[PDB]
Design an enzyme around this catalytic site. Structure first.
Site, mmCIF file in Angstrom:
data_model
loop_
_atom_site.group_PDB
_atom_site.id
_atom_site.type_symbol
_atom_site.label_atom_id
_atom_site.label_comp_id
_atom_site.label_asym_id
_atom_site.label_seq_id
_atom_site.Cartn_x
_atom_site.Cartn_y
_atom_site.Cartn_z
ATOM 1 N N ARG A 1 18.312 2.101 -1.698
ATOM 2 C CA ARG A 1 19.618 2.441 -2.252
ATOM 3 C C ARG A 1 19.466 2.400 -3.799
ATOM 4 O O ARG A 1 19.938 1.500 -4.483
ATOM 5 C CB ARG A 1 20.745 1.506 -1.806
ATOM 6 C CG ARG A 1 21.081 1.525 -0.295
ATOM 7 C CD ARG A 1 22.065 0.423 0.120
ATOM 8 N NE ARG A 1 21.499 -0.885 -0.241
ATOM 9 C CZ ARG A 1 20.556 -1.550 0.428
ATOM 10 N NH1 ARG A 1 20.091 -1.033 1.560
ATOM 11 N NH2 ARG A 1 20.135 -2.689 -0.107
ATOM 12 N N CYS B 1 10.268 0.269 15.854
ATOM 13 C CA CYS B 1 10.243 -0.928 15.019
ATOM 14 C C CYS B 1 9.393 -2.059 15.585
ATOM 15 O O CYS B 1 9.667 -2.524 16.674
ATOM 16 C CB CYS B 1 11.664 -1.463 14.914
ATOM 17 S SG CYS B 1 11.865 -2.876 13.813
ATOM 18 N N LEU B 2 8.485 -2.576 14.769
ATOM 19 C CA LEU B 2 7.681 -3.728 15.228
ATOM 20 C C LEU B 2 8.376 -5.055 14.900
ATOM 21 O O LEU B 2 7.925 -6.065 15.413
ATOM 22 C CB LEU B 2 6.335 -3.683 14.523
ATOM 23 C CG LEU B 2 5.303 -2.675 15.026
ATOM 24 C CD1 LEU B 2 4.353 -2.248 13.919
ATOM 25 C CD2 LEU B 2 4.502 -3.289 16.164
ATOM 26 N N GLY B 3 9.391 -5.058 14.057
ATOM 27 C CA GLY B 3 10.084 -6.298 13.705
ATOM 28 C C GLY B 3 11.360 -6.449 14.539
ATOM 29 O O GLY B 3 12.132 -7.379 14.246
ATOM 30 N N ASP C 1 15.295 -6.028 3.501
ATOM 31 C CA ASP C 1 16.398 -5.041 3.472
ATOM 32 C C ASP C 1 16.794 -4.424 4.776
ATOM 33 O O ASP C 1 17.193 -3.239 4.868
ATOM 34 C CB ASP C 1 16.069 -3.947 2.454
ATOM 35 C CG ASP C 1 17.351 -3.225 2.038
ATOM 36 O OD1 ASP C 1 18.378 -3.917 1.822
ATOM 37 O OD2 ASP C 1 17.367 -1.986 1.917
ATOM 38 N N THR C 2 16.687 -5.149 5.898
ATOM 39 C CA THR C 2 17.112 -4.581 7.184
ATOM 40 C C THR C 2 18.178 -5.468 7.799
ATOM 41 O O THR C 2 19.373 -5.233 7.711
ATOM 42 C CB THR C 2 15.934 -4.367 8.148
ATOM 43 O OG1 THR C 2 15.138 -5.574 8.293
ATOM 44 C CG2 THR C 2 14.960 -3.308 7.562
HETATM 45 C C1 HEM Z 1 18.200 -4.620 12.033
HETATM 46 C C2 HEM Z 1 16.943 -4.622 11.673
HETATM 47 C C3 HEM Z 1 15.952 -3.465 11.689
HETATM 48 C C4 HEM Z 1 16.173 -2.139 11.869
HETATM 49 C C5 HEM Z 1 17.490 -1.409 12.201
HETATM 50 C C6 HEM Z 1 14.872 -1.479 11.766
HETATM 51 C C7 HEM Z 1 14.710 -0.116 11.922
HETATM 52 C C8 HEM Z 1 13.463 0.481 11.914
HETATM 53 C C9 HEM Z 1 13.250 1.895 12.180
HETATM 54 C C10 HEM Z 1 14.408 2.881 12.436
HETATM 55 C C11 HEM Z 1 11.941 2.129 12.133
HETATM 56 C C12 HEM Z 1 11.192 3.490 12.328
HETATM 57 C C13 HEM Z 1 11.049 4.332 11.047
HETATM 58 C C14 HEM Z 1 10.432 5.715 11.209
HETATM 59 O O1 HEM Z 1 10.271 6.086 12.388
HETATM 60 O O2 HEM Z 1 10.201 6.362 10.144
HETATM 61 C C15 HEM Z 1 11.292 0.863 11.835
HETATM 62 C C16 HEM Z 1 9.932 0.667 11.720
HETATM 63 C C17 HEM Z 1 9.334 -0.515 11.351
HETATM 64 N N1 HEM Z 1 10.009 -1.710 11.100
HETATM 65 FE FE1 HEM Z 1 11.893 -2.132 11.559
HETATM 66 N N2 HEM Z 1 13.878 -2.398 11.435
HETATM 67 C C18 HEM Z 1 14.544 -3.618 11.404
HETATM 68 C C19 HEM Z 1 13.931 -4.839 11.113
HETATM 69 C C20 HEM Z 1 12.613 -4.977 10.770
HETATM 70 C C21 HEM Z 1 11.999 -6.215 10.290
HETATM 71 C C22 HEM Z 1 12.767 -7.551 10.136
HETATM 72 C C23 HEM Z 1 10.715 -5.950 10.023
HETATM 73 C C24 HEM Z 1 9.632 -6.906 9.495
HETATM 74 C C25 HEM Z 1 8.806 -6.486 8.525
HETATM 75 C C26 HEM Z 1 10.476 -4.551 10.336
HETATM 76 C C27 HEM Z 1 9.258 -3.905 10.274
HETATM 77 C C28 HEM Z 1 9.027 -2.602 10.692
HETATM 78 C C29 HEM Z 1 7.731 -1.949 10.747
HETATM 79 C C30 HEM Z 1 6.429 -2.668 10.311
HETATM 80 C C31 HEM Z 1 7.918 -0.678 11.094
HETATM 81 C C32 HEM Z 1 6.852 0.425 11.226
HETATM 82 C C33 HEM Z 1 6.305 0.859 12.569
HETATM 83 C C34 HEM Z 1 5.405 2.081 12.442
HETATM 84 O O3 HEM Z 1 5.631 2.844 11.486
HETATM 85 O O4 HEM Z 1 4.541 2.211 13.323
HETATM 86 N N3 HEM Z 1 11.657 -3.996 10.754
HETATM 87 N N4 HEM Z 1 12.243 -0.139 11.727
HETATM 88 C C1 LIG Z 2 13.097 3.048 7.510
HETATM 89 C C2 LIG Z 2 12.725 1.562 7.502
HETATM 90 C C3 LIG Z 2 13.890 0.626 7.865
HETATM 91 C C4 LIG Z 2 11.459 1.284 8.361
HETATM 92 C C5 LIG Z 2 11.030 -0.145 7.992
HETATM 93 C C6 LIG Z 2 11.508 -0.351 6.562
HETATM 94 C C7 LIG Z 2 11.979 1.059 6.208
HETATM 95 C C8 LIG Z 2 12.845 1.193 4.947
HETATM 96 C C9 LIG Z 2 10.651 1.815 6.053
HETATM 97 O O1 LIG Z 2 10.126 2.216 5.025
HETATM 98 C C10 LIG Z 2 10.346 1.936 7.543
#
Ligand code: HEM
Ligand SMILES: CC1(C)[C@@H]2CC[C@@]1(C)C(=O)C2
Ligand SMILES: [K+]
Length: 404
Positions: free
Chosen positions: A176, A347-349, A241-242
């Site tokens: 943002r 998402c892995l988190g 930031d999630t």
């Molecule tokens: C409410 C919480 C969360 C939401 C809504 C969320 C949403 C997402 C989404 C939509 C993606 C896919 C992005 C794409 O396809 O371009 C993603 C990927 C990912 N998120 Fe989450 N996220 C959340 C929390 C977290 C947290 C706490 C972590 C810890 C670091 C995390 C780590 C990742 C990672 C490492 C990926 C990449 C997977 C890949 O590209 O193979 N996320 N997340």
């Molecule tokens: C779109 C996302 C929420 C997902 C994890 C963090 C994020 C900003 C990325 O760059 C991948």
């Protein structure tokens, strides 16, 4: 507004701005949902933010996340300059190459670590809430939404809490932007921070997430310094930031709905299902892909290099996916959404996120069952790659609370 490209027909133009949508004052999910009104086509072209496609329905969003041969993650953010600078791992990669990096990321943010951190997650939620309980008020974004998930991630990453203001500033410029920094500048400042830490943890390996990534293996061969940095950067953004933003959308809703608070108080075992319905209704992410070649998708000609925003937020808000989608129903039978992604970049988190959400709802409602929006406050939202809440002033009577 950028010049309408020759191949894009005038009839598919709908000038939605993902960083400052026209109906933002009605709520950010209401803002994006104007793309789902009767008159709007399934796939539109906006001239805002350099020009790009927008898939407005779940069917299209899901289909495009599934087809990585046509819709590549190499340039996944709008504007085009941010997508091009974007090089985080694994998100900037398509299968097959991407897959070996997921296993290492799973080691530091997946279920394994959720089990390492179970006790600390629980302890911090309860401590922060008990400290606020007697006050009868709080600024939720600063007093809980930020510190709770951020301090847990800084603990996991072996980083000092004094570095939070700097890192949270940089991460927020990637999602943002306020205009002071480009994506590329924020990303390079984030790498500038991590570079020395990764070299130190390669020389003296520890137990923290940066050490584990920096010394990790990907399909049996050592990860490079460069690769470690590109993965670490992504974890820092995920961590700061999630969930931070999602918790405020959820608490805002509960503060405005006494009957939903009553349902979880009476039946705490519905909190996991309530979390999933809130993840659908207050979905908050929107990134996308770049076309690898000219392609006809759903009657519309797309051109090689065209960017397409595939808003994860939009699928569960689609009425064709969920009836009465703007209503929150904790008993909803089929909660369909793509809040945590779709396809090979799921998402892995998500397990860390659901634990943080569920712990917060349970521990907050145990101690502060009744709360409301401060009198006269008008809650303001913000939009971007990840949407959020500017401020959330809450009030309650301390006489209705309880210390555990
Ligand atoms: C409410 C919480 C969360 C939401 C809504 C969320 C949403 C997402 C989404 C939509 C993606 C896919 C992005 C794409 O396809 O371009 C993603 C990927 C990912 N998120 Fe989450 N996220 C959340 C929390 C977290 C947290 C706490 C972590 C810890 C670091 C995390 C780590 C990742 C990672 C490492 C990926 C990449 C997977 C890949 O590209 O193979 N996320 N997340
Ligand atoms: C779109 C996302 C929420 C997902 C994890 C963090 C994020 C900003 C990325 O760059 C991948
Ligand atoms: K790129």
């Amino acid at each position: 507004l950028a010049p309408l490209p020759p191949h894009v027909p005038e009839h598919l133009v709908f000038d939605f701005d993902m960083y400052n949508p026209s109906n933002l004052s009605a709520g950010v999910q209401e803002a994006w949902a104007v793309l789902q009104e009767s008159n709007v086509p399934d796939l539109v072209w906006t001239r805002c933010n350099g020009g790009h496609w927008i898939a407005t329905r779940g069917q299209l969003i899901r289909e495009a996340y599934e087809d990585y041969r046509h819709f590549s993650s190499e340039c996944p953010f709008i504007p085009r300059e941010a997508g091009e600078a974007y090089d985080f791992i694994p998100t900037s990669m398509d299968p097959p190459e991407q897959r070996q990096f997921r296993a290492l990321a799973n080691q530091v943010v997946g279920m394994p670590v959720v089990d390492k951190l179970e006790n600390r997650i629980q302890e911090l939620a309860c401590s922060l809430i008990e400290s606020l309980r007697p006050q009868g008020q709080c600024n939720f974004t600063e007093d809980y939404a930020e510190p709770f998930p951020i301090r847990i991630f800084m603990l996991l990453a072996g980083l000092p809490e004094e570095d939070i203001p700097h890192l949270k500033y940089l991460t927020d410029q990637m999602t943002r932007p306020d205009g002071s920094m480009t994506f590329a500048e924020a990303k390079e400042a984030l790498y500038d921070y991590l570079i020395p830490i990764i070299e130190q943890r390669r020389q003296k390996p520890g137990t923290d997430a940066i050490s584990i990534v920096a010394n990790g293996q990907v399909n049996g061969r050592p990860i490079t310094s460069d690769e470690a940095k590109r993965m670490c950067g992504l974890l820092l953004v995920g961590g700061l930031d999630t969930v931070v933003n999602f918790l405020s959308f959820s608490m805002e809703f509960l503060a405005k709905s006494p009957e939903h608070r009553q349902e979880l108080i009476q039946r705490p075992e519905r909190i996991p299902a309530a979390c999933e319905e809130l993840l659908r209704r207050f979905s908050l992410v929107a990134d996308g892909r770049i076309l690898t070649s000219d392609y006809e998708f759903h009657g519309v000609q797309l051109k090689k290099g065209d960017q397409i925003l595939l808003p994860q937020m939009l699928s569960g808000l689609d009425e064709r996916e969920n009836a009465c989608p703007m209503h929150v129903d904790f008993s909803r039978q089929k909660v369909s959404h793509t809040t945590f992604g779709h396809g090979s970049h799921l998402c892995l988190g998500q397990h860390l996120a659901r634990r943080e959400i569920i712990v917060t709802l349970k521990e907050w409602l145990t101690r502060i069952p009744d709360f409301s929006i401060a009198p006269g406050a008008q809650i303001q939202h913000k939009s971007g790659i990840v949407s959020g809440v500017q401020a959330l002033p809450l009030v309650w009577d301390p006489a209705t609370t309880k210390a555990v």
